[PDB]
Amino acid sequence: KDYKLTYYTPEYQTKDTDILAAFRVTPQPGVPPEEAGAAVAAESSTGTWTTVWTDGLTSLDRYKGRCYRIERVVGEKDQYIAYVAYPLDLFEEGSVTNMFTSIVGNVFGFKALRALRLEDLRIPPAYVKTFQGPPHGIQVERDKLNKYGRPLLGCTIKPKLGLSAKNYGRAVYECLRGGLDFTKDDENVNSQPFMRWRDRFLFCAEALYKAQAETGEIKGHYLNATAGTCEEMIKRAVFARELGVPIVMHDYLTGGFTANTSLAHYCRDNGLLLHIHRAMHAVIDRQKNHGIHFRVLAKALRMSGGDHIHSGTVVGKLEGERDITLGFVDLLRDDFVEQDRSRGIYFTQDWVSLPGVLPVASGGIHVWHMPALTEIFGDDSVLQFGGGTLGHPWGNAPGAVANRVALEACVKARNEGRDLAQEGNEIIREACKWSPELAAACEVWKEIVFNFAAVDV
Amino acid sequence: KDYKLTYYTPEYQTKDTDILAAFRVTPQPGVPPEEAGAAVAAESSTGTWTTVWTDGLTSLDRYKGRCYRIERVVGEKDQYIAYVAYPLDLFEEGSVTNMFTSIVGNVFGFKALRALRLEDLRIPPAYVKTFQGPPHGIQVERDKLNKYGRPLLGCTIKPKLGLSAKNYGRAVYECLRGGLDFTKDDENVNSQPFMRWRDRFLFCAEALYKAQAETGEIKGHYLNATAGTCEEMIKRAVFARELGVPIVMHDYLTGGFTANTSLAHYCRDNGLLLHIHRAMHAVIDRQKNHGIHFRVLAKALRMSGGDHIHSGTVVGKLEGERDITLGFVDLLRDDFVEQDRSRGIYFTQDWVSLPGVLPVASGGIHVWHMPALTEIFGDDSVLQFGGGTLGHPWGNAPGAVANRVALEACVKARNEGRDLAQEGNEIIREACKWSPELAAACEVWKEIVFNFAAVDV
Amino acid sequence: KDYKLTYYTPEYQTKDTDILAAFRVTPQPGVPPEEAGAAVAAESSTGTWTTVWTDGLTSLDRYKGRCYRIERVVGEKDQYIAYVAYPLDLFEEGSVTNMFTSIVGNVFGFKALRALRLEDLRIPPAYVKTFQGPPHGIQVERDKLNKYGRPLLGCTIKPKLGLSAKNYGRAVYECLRGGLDFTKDDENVNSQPFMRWRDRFLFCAEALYKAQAETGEIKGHYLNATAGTCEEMIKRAVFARELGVPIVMHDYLTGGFTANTSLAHYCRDNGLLLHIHRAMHAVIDRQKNHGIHFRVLAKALRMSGGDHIHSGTVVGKLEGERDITLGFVDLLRDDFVEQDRSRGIYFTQDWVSLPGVLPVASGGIHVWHMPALTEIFGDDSVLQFGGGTLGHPWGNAPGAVANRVALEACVKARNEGRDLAQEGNEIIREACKWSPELAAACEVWKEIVFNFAAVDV
Amino acid sequence: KDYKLTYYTPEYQTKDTDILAAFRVTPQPGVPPEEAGAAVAAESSTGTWTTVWTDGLTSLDRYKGRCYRIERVVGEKDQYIAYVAYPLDLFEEGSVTNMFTSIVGNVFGFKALRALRLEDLRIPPAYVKTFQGPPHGIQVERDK
Amino acid sequence: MQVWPPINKKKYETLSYLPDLSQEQLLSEVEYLLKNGWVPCLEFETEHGFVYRENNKSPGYYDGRYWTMWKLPMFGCTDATQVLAEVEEAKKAYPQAWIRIIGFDNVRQVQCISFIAYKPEGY
């Protein structure tokens, strides 16, 4: 089957309504780039080795994917970037499920290729308008919560699996009362023998309302609605609505796009914020040669629907990887993101006012990382801590206070014109003076970085 | 974080109620096997680098995953097989979504590992009983359809995307009237500008009823119910029920497990057979070093629910790969599958009467492959053709007749005591004598394999 | 087709149950008045050029419209007033949609006419009783709101399109807290990218409740429920009901009569006041020679249902136009309106206790117009301001205070026996003494009308 | 209110996502074409004679209709064709009701005009995709 | 080890966990708004200094989010002292009121700043 002479069209001028795809192709030895890129386009559209009579009862050239360009990858050899264009008509309106089925449904198993990786997708404005997108989005969320001028703060309740409903609520209250905005249900925590969902929702609501009453600030707890069936999932969200809480949670990849879109629609119709966890993403997005890059999985979530989405951590990453992260963070928050291959952005993406998603940074984050995080992500982000709150010597509340004080010290310093990049450690040092909670959290750090301590007067 | 001294427990005796996992680990240089396997167990359960106060309000040793064994891989170096045991309590009853979130949720992104691949899972009888499984299963399906003593036959309507509702139905009628049992909606075909779902369901029902009336045999067409939301998906199945048709279809990986379980439940309650397509599987299961092997994805489908599942083709595969396929085919059809590392079966799997799933063989299948397919798969299978029916010189019906005659010739020969392995080509040769349809389909094949032709008398 | 000898019946005595229509006809040259008026009656009833056999299976003279009188228009030549009578049986009970289809469905396109304009309609008591009419009406509304002895006050939130949900609510609170009774959603504001409906309803409810709590007076905000479908429209009203707010809004001409009647019924059953906006009316009612006069569109709204209806402004109009306005204002508020050609009232209209509709005056209204507005409209009216509140130098609240003080000064003066017609400017002058807010709003006006200012003591 | 200097933008390059409108304008005597076309654009979008404080809590130039071209009608005099461009964001998805309310809601009653007639509208692909359209359409109907 | 107080520690969002801003620091915050092109505005409240839920308890609904505006947003303001002057005037007229400074962004119709500038006695 010589696809090259039908699916490889370098003269093709892409239309405003086309869905464009950037594939990183690693063809089998002997297989030319043009033929590999044509095999990719062919398999993900009409998929024909030759011709059958039914192909005459329509126009093949109307519904075919077209490889219009090939580019050799600067680094490794035997690796190319194939650009494919898909007609708007191939896709069902409002269905991320159909978009993924058409583009990544069968091509990754083609024999002529050794490895295949979808790097990016250009979602045209005409297809974007068929999606509801985030239930609320960054702006509406800040307005509902009445929180402005700083990153939001959250913490994970540990251990992951194991705690009872009442103990879970206790940790929720202690963390929230200390200065945190949100607490989190573990992604694995749904409904189990040690803790059934309804009891958890009930005690967590009691805990979050107490902390809100005590502090005077609006609180929220991501109540996991992920379930075995769509009916159970909705049944769980319905109870969150009855309790009057602000936010629910969902594991979009393990739950699935069909179920996630249903929940997102429900959340829009009922005023619930939707926190998304990316569990299982690394089985798909880790290897550089095979799979789907997270930036595509992030675009899919923004279309399907979610107000927050876990987007990893930037701590301990080479600029390089950091640039890739900032690349997809922009794709999630901004309305218009211009093409920029240096940050892994293969296409200019126009979101035509689709609400932006709040990126959630988590993973080994400590108070002394606050300066760098505040500078890198900016205000529109949610910074989540695990052992930085639970692992504080004095407990949850003092641990939450330490993180809240550290963050506000960074915000104040930034606003006063200080460079968070070079004065970071000093900013935390000064803050330790007026915060016993922050000081106790910085002990081991002071000994290594400052070779001491202390205070003076 | 030294997991090894807490998560690596070689003295552990697995319980009848434990979920066991066989991971193929490729650790980073310097990282010991015991520590890597302990990192895998730790991350996919309690996930603690150290200790927080909440860990004392429960028993960590009660909900932790345990690496109880490590095995070096015979072939490559730096590759080990880590066996992990998970307590029954960590999982939500009846939820494949939760099972995948707990086991493959975060481990694939751990830094101490270079690559990770889930090879198998031992689902204990106590967890199996919390699932409905296939809506019907092999036996009930044969009884409903009144089809016994031979593989079932199906064909794909091509092109994949592009045809209109009435033309789609026309190809459906022509294929079915020729001897095929089932016709298939493309996995990409849901509801689009060129063909809306309801029109397709309506014309395909008319076509399948005509072919059934004409032939006297029960016919079916996999009507794709995959959609953007759970509500749309159910709405589509509801119409199939109103039309009184026998089978619907779903793309379980792109649609998702939560949505698939909902559809499966619906199908059981309404007497609909459920055909499952594995679109997107190769982005997860192709690479030997990273991802999830298809045998695990197949086990998950059997639990979530499906009566048929695409399981690739055996044509042109080394015994080797063929043995792996027969391995998961048994896991899908049989009640008890004993451990056998030669066929990639790491654990003995007891299905405690959960209905078996009918494997669907498709991909470059031609009439001359019939002998080998009938012998390898046996009667309990569905053999699907694409160009072997549509690409027949005389059209769909004669193409369907050729495949039906070829299959029955193989069944008859097998029953008469003939070896399909060595007499395969001869069996098809004899059949060409009494079938002009089969003869025309074997032209190019006769010239190469038999260097002729013909008939005599 | 000589209609004249069958449809022109000058001897006809109208029945108490007939629907009468006054058309302003401009026939083509050569076409006689009697023939033109007969063509109008014929086309809007039985519509027959000649005779077909089916006309004998009934009585044509039982369902035909009859032109019983022609009158030459005093002003222009070639312009006549044709009076047509329609049998009660031609109309579906309770359907304004059917009434408009029968009367104005095809006649405006008849060739024998150059232009046609429906000036008035006499709705007989027997047809009026088949309609629910306004959900509440003037009296019940004042009782629900506990507001008596003065016109009600409202203001528009500007810009029309553009503001976010929270900012919209902020302007709502500031205006309402200053003395206004109602605030208004723009007619264009439904649900858009910059502001989704549910967020608007939520923030506007918070804002109106705060202003009510602060002032001690009942507040309301017209929440626009206009939508693309009937289902969305009702879904929006349902949420307003859940929030416990007093009033919703609808664009009856762009939304349509079928949808408006549904909303009106919903509002009666759920205790919601219904504010009607007349968007698109000028494409129908502006030209004196062709279209439908607003008095007919106003009668239709009172039947279909609405508690308030925009009826333009009287500022800067010749008596003449002012008399026409007072004519339809009476038709909206009163129970019995006697025929009066000087005010454009072609028929005596008996409303048989159908609730009256509150007229809403808006369009370039400033504080110094208050005296004339209070005198012309009386207490039963709603006076809406745009830049008279938002454009006040000190903002929304002080702008609302200025309008409230100005109105009360006019009411007090009127009650004390003062002539608002000749003492208007002086009344506002005196009020400026005790109201800094009113003084600041009258600056440019004082300089022109009084050539100063000031105060004394 | 001098709209002309804010709503009449002949340098404007229409976007693929804009809803375009072709109005046949018959202005009142003395009223210039540029000012009439700007009055049409202004009234059917932001509709402001001047400025209020709320206009600063957003960007007026983001949600305004713009008259980008005027053309004299060959036949009659005092009749012009005004082209207006509306941002995609002004409209509710799938609602013809909202589209008509925004474009033809208030402009036909503006005083500076003697008569106004909407001749055509360019519905961009991005707005078209938010509608279901005909239940079936020509082809499906013939097939049924 | 110290115990975080469950009472008398009511907060007002951004910057409220830091020691009360000195007039100099308060002035630096206002200059950040101006440097970014944000329109400053003052809000004050005398009765409900914290959110509550009296009129409805559905998701996302809270009473007490809106405070009353002090005059008008300060468009065209170039001197941060003009803003600081208004805070003095506001607390002079309403000493028992909480006063906060908010900032508005135009590219975005949003508010993007909100910090407490004055708190009444015993707060």
Side-chain angles (χ1 to χ4, degrees), chain B residues 2-67:
Chain B
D2 206 290
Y3 296 121
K4 171 179 165 61
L5 304 170
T6 313
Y7 297 92
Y8 179 57
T9 61
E11 5 70 25
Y12 185 66
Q13 213 66 214
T14 60
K15 306 179 186 181
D16 301 310
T17 59
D18 284 347
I19 278 72
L20 308 181
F23 286 100
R24 181 194 290 288
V25 192
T26 296
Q28 287 288 347
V31 173
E34 303 75 40
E35 190 184 294
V40 163
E43 294 303 287
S44 55
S45 57
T46 54
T48 63
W49 15 245
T50 66
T51 309
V52 297
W53 71 270
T54 38
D55 285 300
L57 302 195
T58 319
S59 56
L60 203 287
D61 307 290
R62 197 193 186 302
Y63 303 104
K64 74 185 183 70
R66 308 168 195 73
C67 183

Side-chain angles (χ1 to χ4, degrees), chain A residues 54 92 106 158 187 227 230 258, chain B residues 54 106 158 187 227 230 258:
Chain A
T54 38
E92 173 165 1
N106 304 292
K158 310 207 76 58
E187 59 276 12
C230 302
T258 291
Chain B
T54 38
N106 304 292
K158 310 207 76 58
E187 59 276 12
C230 302
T258 291

Side-chain angles (χ1 to χ4, degrees), chain C residues 102-362:
Chain C
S102 289
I103 303 168
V104 312
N106 304 292
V107 288
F108 294 68
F110 199 58
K111 291 305 172 188
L113 315 175
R114 177 188 293 142
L116 184 58
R117 194 197 206 199
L118 181 56
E119 288 284 342
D120 204 4
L121 279 181
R122 193 288 296 274
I123 312 300
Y127 196 46
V128 175
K129 292 301 294 182
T130 71
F131 294 83
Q132 174 201 275
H136 307 270
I138 302 175
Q139 293 67 34
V140 174
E141 174 166 353
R142 287 190 166 283
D143 286 337
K144 291 283 177 82
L145 305 182
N146 204 217
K147 298 178 185 292
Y148 312 96
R150 72 173 176 79
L152 304 184
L153 294 176
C155 96
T156 67
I157 308 300
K158 310 207 76 58
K160 298 180 65 63
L161 297 165
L163 288 171
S164 73
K166 186 182 172 174
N167 282 346
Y168 216 75
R170 193 189 317 271
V172 164
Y173 161 64
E174 297 295 340
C175 292
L176 292 181
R177 79 180 203 88
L180 298 188
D181 303 304
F182 303 118
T183 36
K184 175 220 179 193
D185 260 4
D186 197 80
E187 59 276 12
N188 297 331
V189 163
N190 294 179
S191 191
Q192 288 107 328
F194 56 83
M195 174 173 48
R196 294 303 177 186
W197 74 274
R198 203 175 184 290
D199 295 325
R200 182 176 71 254
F201 283 39
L202 192 148
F203 285 120
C204 288
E206 194 200 326
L208 79 85
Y209 284 134
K210 186 187 173 67
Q212 176 170 129
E214 180 184 313
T215 61
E217 295 184 335
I218 298 177
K219 306 296 179 171
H221 178 84
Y222 320 147
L223 288 168
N224 207 161
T226 307
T229 61
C230 302
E231 297 79 13
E232 264 302 307
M233 174 190 69
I234 292 294
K235 175 175 159 188
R236 293 176 192 192
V238 166
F239 187 50
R241 200 254 193 246
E242 176 182 340
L243 292 176
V245 297
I247 181 160
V248 292
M249 179 185 154
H250 190 232
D251 303 333
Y252 89 116
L253 297 179
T254 59
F257 290 116
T258 291
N260 191 75
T261 309
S262 287
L263 183 54
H265 284 357
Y266 179 83
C267 287
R268 163 70 63 87
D269 288 333
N270 290 274
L272 288 160
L273 292 170
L274 184 52
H275 177 80
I276 305 291
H277 193 280
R278 57 172 195 173
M280 194 181 76
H281 77 107
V283 337
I284 300 171
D285 72 17
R286 193 182 182 177
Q287 305 307 145
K288 294 189 178 187
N289 65 296
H290 194 86
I292 301 172
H293 192 279
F294 185 64
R295 75 179 66 90
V296 175
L297 299 182
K299 281 196 181 185
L301 184 276
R302 184 172 180 181
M303 285 157 83
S304 183
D307 298 309
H308 299 177
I309 189 182
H310 277 243
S311 54
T313 187
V314 80
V315 174
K317 280 187 182 299
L318 289 59
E319 63 179 67
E321 313 173 295
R322 160 190 194 126
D323 277 354
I324 297 297
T325 290
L326 293 184
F328 66 73
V329 162
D330 276 2
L331 284 176
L332 281 169
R333 308 193 305 208
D334 303 335
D335 186 49
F336 190 85
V337 187
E338 193 177 296
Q339 175 183 221
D340 183 359
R341 300 287 295 280
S342 80
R343 299 190 312 161
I345 304 171
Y346 299 68
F347 302 103
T348 287
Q349 180 65 62
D350 187 3
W351 288 111
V352 290
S353 295
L354 217 245
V357 182
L358 222 36
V360 180
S362 69

